[PDB]
Design a protein around this ligand. Structure first.
Ligand SMILES: Cc1ncnc2c1ccn2[C@@H]1O[C@@H]2[C@@H](Oc3ccc4cc(Br)c(N)nc4c3)CC[C@]2(O)[C@H]1O
Lengths: 625, 311
């Protein structure tokens, strides 16, 4: 299922050309809206008074066709950054005319090239068009992986091609894009149409496009190799990039004439459909996460707020998570009570934050496996979840389980526990306040008692994602700090991003907390080596937890628990993007702060440059105690 | 009376005007606006009856527009098309029809410039796809393909008497001297200063190591390939120099085409002798009469075929 388009710069009859590309199987068509050679004058007479029409009529297609099948293209003679003033003034007038016409037609996308370093005036004129009205139309900046100057044949005897490695120079077209979208102030309407050449650049040059809003990939017919039967095909390296772009769900565009003339134009299409059908299928996690890609969510605050029914339902449909919890209990029971005591000793187990009872059931299953005697207390503060627990206790569990409707920090337990079990962990481990909860409860755990989980560690990693930076920027709410959306974390399935350095551990908590003076506050400095040129947009947060001994759960990509889809990564953004060069170190500082009523995080980048301290005093984000 | 196969009307945008050795005018026209964006080829054995369709010797329509044209001998017509094809059309045995010889889609974008090489067996083309292709007219194939430029190819001009030599100029600011005999065929030439983009080229018809070029600012420059640093230059036009054509004279005159809607006629020192504001739109070609050397014909986007009497 590849959505594809045909790029044409020659359309004699619009209807016949449209029907032609349709028969060939193309979903849309990129075409000129004014004749590409029809240079127009706006200042100088007599050419200014040229009789009309200036182009073909809108009546030639239905409104629907214009909205869905046509991608406009700027005329190649429009040069807003030309050194000739007369050309600069005229191209500004022509650029506006063409863009206004495409907006008049209701075109879904419109293409403009970035075929040189300086596009300041092209940016001034486009930005101006965006701020003239309020529309949904996209602008696809046609930009190549390799600039033409860097891919030209070595055939100029007195002007030869440089055979030296220029790490930064090979990434010149990315800088063209970067500068153009910076000038246009990261408009959500401006995206990349990435043109792939016959020869691929170094992987660093390709990786430089990670986290960028790529909406289209342009494949010229020329890059296609010929197979033994005469069919157009691609090199193993070109396939790698195609597969990468398929994940980003870009629209593929075929540009150029048919060079495999024995076959039809649908042969270029058939190859892409074949490549699309022959990729690894969506695995349990990738199938689950589908739809949530780069979708920002507020992290849950299950202590302050009572969770909804369908939320516990989602938590529950994660077999791996509770399989591991079962195994951690099963292991702890054998270690605590020997086979000789298998009928004398009854273990007091306390599920702290029982929800709808998945850990109460997992404890029962662990006992009917370890063949040991257990007493259960199912503590839950959410009275709505307690209704589920008490209807469970009556109809199944019986007197074996004591349902407690209380806050675990307030509860006066009749006896002590051998094991306190809980699932109070967030995507950043301690973000749902697992430390504070378990500290208020550890008074009713036996002097030799076990906590499942016994330990948890959060991890941070610097990331680049212009898509997620803009996604956050758009989270501006009235009646609050206009910059507040940057001073809060988000639970998101990070998809279009680039991990700038390996995750490093951030905050660690251990239960029981045997410390004489318990302090859950933290200050931590991380130094991240970056071996690429990039733009820092924020930090991806993850976690790892020891439930019991070797039985663990992890969302850190290097050690991610297989098939476990409960927690998505967390994101700590920064207000202003930070330029990072190859070889530099990203230094971040994170604090975990609290008072008697609330807990929060503060953060700051101190290298290569400083950021402001994010979330001072919990002004934008706090977690209620 | 309109000939058989010839279209009822001619497309407004007149692109090319080429006098044959016998005095018969060849026309190239494109439909650049309106519903259909195609082109056509015309022959006027009576040049004073053009652009009137019903008073032509031959006429045909092309699939797409006509960006450039050139006479391949006395019966052949080589066309640079928007389709990406370089087309060869041949005159009828009676010279009453214009029949398709070949239509090869080799370029990935609009073909904008064509020049047939001194022999007449080969030709060179320049496209917006940044390529330059050397063609075998007889074999109907591309012999060589050169990606020397970094932006679209604006002009390609074959040497008057060398089948290996030809000039090219692009929006990448390079003027390239080509010699297919050299292992690296192109060589970057021109004045010391980079200046403004080159738009048009014209070899000298007598001095085989001299040519002229027009820039995007209206400047016409006199260049020696040898001294490879220009001496003479005249700001002939207020806008882009579209074309440069040399008169058939032993001491040739230089016709200057422009987007400023004017025509100028210059001498050996690039001085103005004539000027015509006759056109109301862009001047797209110039062709000196073979029969009357002091007669010069121009076409424009205003659908005019003006015949100038050059003093
Ligand atoms: C002081 C106190 N006393 C008694 N109960 C308490 C408290 C503090 C919290 N709770 C209870 O703990 C339960 C918590 O269970 C879960 C279950 C699954 C999760 C999955 C993910 Br993904 C995730 N991010 N977090 C999860 C949290 C949240 C929902 C819950 O039922 C609260 O009411």
């Amino acid at each position: 299922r590849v959505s594809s388009g045909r790029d044409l710069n020659c359309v004699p009859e619009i209807a016949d050309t449209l029907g032609a590309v349709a028969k060939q199987g193309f979903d849309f068509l990129c075409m000129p809206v004014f004749h590409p050679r029809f240079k127009r004058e706006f200042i100088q007479e007599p050419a200014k008074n040229r009789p009309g029409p200036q182009t073909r009529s809108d009546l030639l297609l239905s409104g629907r066709d214009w909205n869905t099948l046509i991608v406009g293209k700027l005329s190649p003679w429009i040069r807003p950054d030309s050194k000739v003033e007369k050309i600069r003034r005229n191209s500004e007038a022509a650029m506006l005319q063409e863009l206004n016409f495409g907006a008049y037609l209701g075109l879904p996308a419109f293409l403009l090239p970035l075929n040189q370093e300086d596009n300041t005036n092209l940016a001034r004129v486009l930005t101006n068009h965006i701020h003239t009205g309020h529309h949904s139309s996209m602008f696809w900046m046609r930009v190549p992986l390799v600039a033409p100057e860097d891919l030209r044949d070595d055939i100029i005897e007195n002007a030869p091609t440089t055979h030296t490695e220029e790490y930064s120079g090979e990434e010149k077209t990315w800088m063209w894009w970067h500068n153009f979208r910076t000038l246009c102030d990261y408009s959500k309407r401006i995206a990349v149409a990435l043109e792939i050449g016959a020869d691929l650049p170094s992987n660093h040059v390709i990786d430089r496009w990670l986290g960028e809003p790529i909406k289209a990939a342009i494949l010229p017919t020329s890059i296609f190799l010929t197979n033994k039967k005469g069919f157009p095909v691609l090199s193993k390296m070109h396939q790698r990039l195609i597969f990468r772009l398929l994940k980003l769900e870009v629209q593929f565009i075929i540009t150029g004439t048919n060079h495999h003339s024995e076959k039809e134009f649908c042969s270029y299409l058939q190859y892409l459909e074949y490549l699309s059908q022959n990729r690894p299928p969506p695995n349990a996690y990738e199938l689950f996460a589908k739809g949530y890609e780069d979708y920002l969510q507020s992290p849950l605050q299950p202590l302050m707020d009572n969770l909804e029914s369908q939320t516990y339902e989602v938590f529950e449909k994660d077999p791996i998570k509770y399989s591991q919890y079962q195994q951690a209990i099963y292991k702890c029971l054998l270690d605590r009570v020997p086979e000789e005591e298998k009928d004398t000793n009854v273990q007091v187990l306390m599920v702290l934050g029982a929800g709808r009872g998945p850990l109460v059931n997992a404890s029962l299953r662990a006992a009917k496996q370890a063949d040991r005697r257990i007493k259960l207390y199912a503590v839950e503060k959410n009275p709505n979840a307690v209704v589920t627990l008490e209807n469970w206790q009556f109809e199944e569990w019986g007197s074996q389980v004591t349902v407690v409707s209380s806050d675990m920090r307030e509860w006066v337990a009749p006896e002590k526990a051998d094991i306190i079990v809980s699932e109070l962990l967030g995507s950043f481990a301690d973000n749902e306040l697992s430390p504070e909860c378990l500290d208020g409860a550890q008074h009713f755990l036996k002097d030799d008692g076990v906590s499942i989980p016994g330990e948890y560690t959060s991890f941070l990693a610097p990331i680049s994602s212009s898509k997620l930076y803009n996604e956050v920027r758009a989270c501006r709410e009235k009646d609050r700090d206009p910059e507040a959306q940057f001073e809060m974390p988000y639970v998101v399935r990070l998809h279009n991003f680039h991990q700038l350095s390996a995750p490093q551990p951030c905050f660690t908590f251990s239960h029981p907390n045997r410390d004489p003076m318990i302090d859950n506050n933290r200050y931590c400095t991380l130094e991240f080596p970056v071996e690429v040129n990039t733009v820092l947009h924020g930090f991806a947060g993850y976690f790892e937890t020891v439930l019991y001994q070797d039985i663990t759960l992890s969302i850190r990509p290097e050690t991610h628990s297989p098939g476990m889809f409960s927690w998505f990564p967390i994101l700590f953004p920064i207000k202003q993007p930070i330029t990072v060069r190859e070889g530099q170190t990203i230094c971040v500082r994170f604090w975990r702060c609290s008072n008697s009523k609330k807990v929060w995080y503060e953060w700051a980048v101190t290298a290569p440059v400083c950021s402001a301290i994010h979330n001072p005093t919990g002004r934008s984000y706090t977690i209620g105690l | 009376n309109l000939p058989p196969n010839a279209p009822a009307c001619m497309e407004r945008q007149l692109e090319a005007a080429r006098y044959r050795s016998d005095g018969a005018l060849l026309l190239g026209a494109s439909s650049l606006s309106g519903r259909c964006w195609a082109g056509s080829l015309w022959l006027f054995k009576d040049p004073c009856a053009a652009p009137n369709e019903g008073f032509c010797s031959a006429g045909v329509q092309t699939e797409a527009g006509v960006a450039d044209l050139t006479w391949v001998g006395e019966r052949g017509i080589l066309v640079a098309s928007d389709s990406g094809a370089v087309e060869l059309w041949e005159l009828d045995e009676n010279e009453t029809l214009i029949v398709s010889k070949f239509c090869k889609y080799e370029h990935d974008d609009i073909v904008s410039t064509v020049s047939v090489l001194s022999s007449g067996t080969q030709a060179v083309s320049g496209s917006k796809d940044i390529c330059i292709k050397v063609w075998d007219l007889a074999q109907q194939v591309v012999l060589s393909s050169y990606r020397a430029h970094a932006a679209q190819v604006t002009c390609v001009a074959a040497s008057p008497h060398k089948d290996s030599v030809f000039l090219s100029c692009s929006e990448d600011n390079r003027i390239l001297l080509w010699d297919t005999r050299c292992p690296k065929p192109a060589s970057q030439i021109g004045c010391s200063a980079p200046g403004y983009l080159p738009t048009s080229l014209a070899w000298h018809p007598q001095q085989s190591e001299v040519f002229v070029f027009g820039d995007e600012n209206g400047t016409v420059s006199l260049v020696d390939t040898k001294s490879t640093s220009c001496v003479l230059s005249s700001a002939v036009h207020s806008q882009c120099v579209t074309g440069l054509v040399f008169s058939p004279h032993s001491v040739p005159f230089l016709a200057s085409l422009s987007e400023d809607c004017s025509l100028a006629v210059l001498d050996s020192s690039l001085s103005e002798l004539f000027r015509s504001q006759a056109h109301r739109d862009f001047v797209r070609d110039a062709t000196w009469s073979p029969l009357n050397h002091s007669l010069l014909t121009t076409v424009g986007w205003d659908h005019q075929v003006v015949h100038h009497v050059v003093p």
